[PDB]
């Protein structure tokens, strides 16, 4: 499992719980949606982009 479309709209706490169950060594970082990010590829990382309600705004994916 590398993508989580079912988590769009969930809170950060809810999303982290599911991702860690599916990918125990996931390196999760939370950022505002609409930002620019570094383009290195990290297979263990999962960025969570959040909206103004602090909910997952985009499909989480490894990288």
């Amino acid at each position: 499992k590398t993508e989580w479309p079912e988590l769009v709209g969930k809170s950060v706490e809810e999303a982290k719980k599911v991702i860690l169950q599916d990918k125990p060594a996931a390196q999760i970082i939370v950022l505002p949606v609409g930002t620019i990010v570094t383009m290195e590829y990290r297979i263990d990382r999962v960025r969570l982009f959040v909206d103004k309600l602090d909910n997952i705004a985009q499909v989480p994916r490894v990288g």
Binding site: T35, T38, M39, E40, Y41, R42
Partner: protein, 281 residues
């Protein structure tokens, strides 16, 4: 002892160094998370920060900008690694904070600073999934001012017959760079599409890390600086070539690889680019 990363030799950069072309007096802005200016294998000429909470551009709290900077210009000596353009004038334009992210306005601010400070080359090992008219305007203005603008194509792999190139790489004014390994095979994460221009080494790339360290990273972020450094080598041999001529020399002298949708023009060859005779620019 110094070790030359495979990618530097693969794009034929040491051929130019042996002729005396090392990027001297060419100004390259690394628009990224800052550059650790204290690294013994780097010489930072200047910089500026656009990150409100991190005014010092010479403190890299992420590590990515220092690694990108080492691919462009790690010093030629008896320690660490070797950059593509080891004599380049390297500028730390910090637009990303410790978490590796930045607002679009901070990236645009860094591009505006780069134009105002007469940078010859801009490297942007960064991107986002959406564009903006202001971001497009900034990269277009830099190219209209004569700057060579290079960016990572993105790490979004494939999606049917659609483009996965992110922004600012997707704009036609920018040279969007994908990633290959030491065997010239496209990395599965490398973005694809009509906007992909050229490829460069982006798998297991050794470079400088903050605190007098070295390490390997993967990504189109690692491929981009090989091309930005190659542009600086070309300008050190041909100071009168326009950005249009530097870009065409790199795109029209590549080693052809796979289909253009996945590989663009192919792998850059800076030795061939620096010997190029233009017929259209």
């Amino acid at each position: 002892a110094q070790s030359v990363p495979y990618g530097v030799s693969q794009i034929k950069a040491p051929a130019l160094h042996s002729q005396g072309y090392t990027g001297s007096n060419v100004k390259v802005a690394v628009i990224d998370s800052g550059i650790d200016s204290s690294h013994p294998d780097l010489k930072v000429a200047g910089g500026a920060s656009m990150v409100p909470s991190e005014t010092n551009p010479f403190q890299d709290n992420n590590s990515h900008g220092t690694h990108v900077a080492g691919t462009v210009a790690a010093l030629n000596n008896s320690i660490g690694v070797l950059g593509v353009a080891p004599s380049a004038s390297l500028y730390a334009v910090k637009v990303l904070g410790a978490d590796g992210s930045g607002q679009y306005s901070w990236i645009i601010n860094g591009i505006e600073w780069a134009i105002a400070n007469n940078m010859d080359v801009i490297n942007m090992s960064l991107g986002g999934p959406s564009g903006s008219a202001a971001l497009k305007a900034a990269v277009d203005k830099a190219v209209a001012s004569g700057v060579v603008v290079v960016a990572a194509a993105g790490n979004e792999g494939t999606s049917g017959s659609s483009s996965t190139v992110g922004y600012p790489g997707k704009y036609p004014s920018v040279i969007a760079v994908g990633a290959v390994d030491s065997s010239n095979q496209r990395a599965s994460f490398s973005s694809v599409g009509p906007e992909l221009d050229v490829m460069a080494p982006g798998v297991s790339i050794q470079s400088t890390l903050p605190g007098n360290k070295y390490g390997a990273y993967n990504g189109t972020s690692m491929a981009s600086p090989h091309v930005a450094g190659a542009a600086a080598l070309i300008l050190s041999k041909h100071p009168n070539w326009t950005n249009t001529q530097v870009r065409s020399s790199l795109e029209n002298t590549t080693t052809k690889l796979g289909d253009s949708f996945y590989y663009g023009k192919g792998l850059i060859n800076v030795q061939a680019a620096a010997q190029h005779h233009h017929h259209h620019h």
